[PDB]
Design a protein around this ligand. Structure first.
Ligand SMILES: N[C@@H](CCC(=O)N[C@@H](CSSC[C@H](NC(=O)CC[C@H](N)C(=O)O)C(=O)NCC(=O)O)C(=O)NCC(=O)O)C(=O)O
Ligand SMILES: [Br-]
Ligand SMILES: [Br-]
Ligand SMILES: [Br-]
Ligand SMILES: [Br-]
Length: 210
């Protein structure tokens, strides 16, 4: 007779992962429902908008509210968990990194979705053009705030979304972050020292292609 969180998604990190990391770092238990591709066609017609992620929150009042749009869900939760910045400047810094990372996310997702044949050319394009432009911005943004956290001295949704996005860069363009953007690589290495609940979750997490 209390609260409950149920997250709906595919068996992927993709758009769901920032929400899972947020709930994990906030110390909030939740039902992480990850369904198969085969199960989806019969789940789809039952969900609002026919897309995932969806977060079902059963309130203190026992009532159900179903939330759509991954980073809308994430920002609402982050506000509730005091992980969306404590000043307007911190809020700005968080929004700055998220905007930059949304661009990076799209670049790398496009690569993931490219067939094996045409992938390498999209990768070379990324490494020479939009990749360093975006990654420079992200590096400069993180450097401005001290290199360890996007905003304040504690974990925020900005840190977590930066982390998930860098994971995608590291997997999609192997070695690149490590050679060209070592401070971002270091952020990715060190962030779980600032959320050990994260460290545990990451180690036990199922492996997924994206
Ligand atoms: N911005 C929303 C995106 C949510 C989203 O795209 N969900 C996808 C999974 S991530 S995957 C990203 C998504 N692509 C797709 O869903 C692939 C196309 C589909 N499977 C098909 O058959 O055509 C996409 O492009 N999104 C942004 C856009 O539309 O411009 C989904 O539920 N797909 C099941 C379905 O539609 O049946 C969020 O972050 O929550
Ligand atoms: Br990720
Ligand atoms: Br991740
Ligand atoms: Br390289
Ligand atoms: Br760097």
């Amino acid at each position: 007779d209390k609260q409950h969180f149920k997250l709906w998604y595919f068996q992927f990190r993709g758009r769901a992962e920032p929400i899972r990391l947020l709930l994990t770092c906030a110390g909030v238990k939740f039902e992480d429902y990850q369904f198969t591709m085969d199960q989806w066609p019969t789940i789809k017609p039952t969900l609002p908008g026919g897309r995932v992620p969806l977060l079902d929150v059963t309130g203190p009042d026992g009532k159900l509210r179903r939330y759509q749009e991954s980073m809308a869900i994430a920002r609402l939760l982050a506000r509730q968990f005091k992980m969306m910045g404590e000043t307007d400047e911190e809020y700005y810094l968080i929004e700055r990194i998220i905007g930059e990372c949304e661009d990076l996310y799209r670049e790398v997702y496009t690569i993931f979705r490219t067939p094996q044949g045409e992938k390498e050319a999209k990768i070379k394009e990324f490494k020479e053009n939009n990749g360093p432009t975006l990654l420079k911005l992200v590096s400069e943004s993180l450097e401005s705030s001290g290199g360890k956290h996007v905003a304040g001295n504690r974990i925020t949704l900005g840190d977590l979304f930066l982390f998930t996005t860098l994971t995608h860069v590291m997997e999609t363009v192997p070695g690149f972050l490590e050679q060209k953007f070592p401070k971002l690589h270091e952020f990715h290495k060190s962030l779980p020292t600032s959320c050990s609940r994260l460290s545990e979750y990451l180690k036990k997490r199922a492996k997924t292609p994206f």
